[PDB]
Design a protein around this motif. Structure first.
Motif, PDB file in Angstrom:
ATOM      1  N   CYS A 146       0.866  -1.206   0.000  1.00 33.94           N
ATOM      2  CA  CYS A 146       0.000   0.000   0.000  1.00 33.94           C
ATOM      3  C   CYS A 146       0.896   1.247   0.000  1.00 33.94           C
ATOM      4  CB  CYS A 146      -0.988  -0.006   1.164  1.00 33.94           C
ATOM      5  SG  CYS A 146      -0.169   0.237   2.776  1.00 33.94           S
ATOM      6  N   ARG A 147       0.327   2.445  -0.219  1.00 29.66           N
ATOM      7  CA  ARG A 147       1.136   3.694  -0.221  1.00 29.66           C
ATOM      8  C   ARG A 147       0.681   4.679   0.877  1.00 29.66           C
ATOM      9  NH1 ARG A 147       4.578   4.011  -4.696  1.00 29.66           N
ATOM     10  NH2 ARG A 147       5.842   5.247  -3.262  1.00 29.66           N
ATOM     11  N   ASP A 148      -0.524   4.547   1.392  1.00 32.44           N
ATOM     12  CA  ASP A 148      -1.095   5.527   2.363  1.00 32.44           C
ATOM     13  C   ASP A 148      -0.765   5.106   3.792  1.00 32.44           C
ATOM     14  OD1 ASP A 148      -3.326   7.862   2.688  1.00 32.44           O
ATOM     15  OD2 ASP A 148      -3.584   6.240   4.148  1.00 32.44           O
ATOM     16  N   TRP A 151      -3.914   3.756   5.636  1.00 28.38           N
ATOM     17  CA  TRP A 151      -4.245   2.412   5.097  1.00 28.38           C
ATOM     18  C   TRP A 151      -3.306   1.356   5.673  1.00 28.38           C
ATOM     19  CZ3 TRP A 151      -7.197   1.191   0.109  1.00 28.38           C
ATOM     20  CH2 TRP A 151      -8.298   2.034  -0.011  1.00 28.38           C
TER      21      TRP A 151
HETATM   22 CL   LIG Z   1      -2.822   2.856  -0.447  1.00 31.97          CL
END
Ligand SMILES: [Cl-]
Ligand SMILES: COC(=O)c1ccc(O)cc1
Ligand SMILES: [Cl-]
Ligand SMILES: [Cl-]
Length: 163
Positions: A146-148, A151
């Motif tokens: 994931c990137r966030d 999240w």
């Molecule tokens: Cl993400």
């Protein structure tokens, strides 16, 4: 299989993964695309030879000996909530078949239909639960990318909840 099959989550570019194969969040036409798909095209361009496949399916193409599993989630801009939910579940079931067929001990996987195919909704829980439904019967180590930052925390919580 893995000696003690696990789920993990990492916040980084899936093109830098440490797993034995990668799942691409592909488009149906095998185009370079954007986000995860663009990163996968830059790292493994040879894997886009004849990678076009319909929504709700997965198609594996080798880059050398490294398998790229092109998984096509629905774009919720075009699908009804009902039909999109069915196709998103189906894409992950086809990823589980390919991971099993390949005999890998580990797989790097993004959350399908959570970016530009999300139809502007937060689908973390929907997409993650379909991932678990498909992958729980496999014995590969699964590493979700994931990137966030928020999240990452929510995916990590959801994994730890069931252990
Ligand atoms: Cl993400
Ligand atoms: C899990 O998301 C990625 O790997 C990713 C890579 C490149 C982007 O530009 C966006 C997301
Ligand atoms: Cl990174
Ligand atoms: Cl997406």
């Amino acid at each position: 299989g893995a000696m003690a099959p696990s789920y993990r989550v990492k916040r980084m570019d899936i093109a830098k993964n440490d797993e034995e194969c990668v799942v691409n969040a592909a488009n149906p036409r095998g185009l370079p695309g954007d986000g995860v798909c663009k990163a996968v095209y830059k790292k493994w361009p040879e894997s886009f030879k004849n990678s076009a496949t319909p929504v709700g399916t997965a198609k594996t193409v080798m880059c050398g000996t490294y398998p790229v599993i092109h998984a096509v989630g629905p774009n919720f801009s075009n699908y009804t909530e009902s039909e999109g939910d069915r196709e998103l579940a189906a894409a992950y079931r086809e990823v589980a078949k390919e991971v099993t067929r390949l005999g890998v001990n580990s797989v790097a996987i993004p959350l399908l239909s959570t970016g530009v195919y999300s139809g502007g909704k937060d689908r973390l829980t929907q997409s993650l639960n379909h991932l678990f439904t498909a992958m729980d019967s496999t014995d590969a180590d699964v590493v979700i990318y994931c990137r966030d930052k928020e999240w990452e925390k929510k995916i990590s919580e959801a994994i730890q909840m069931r252990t």
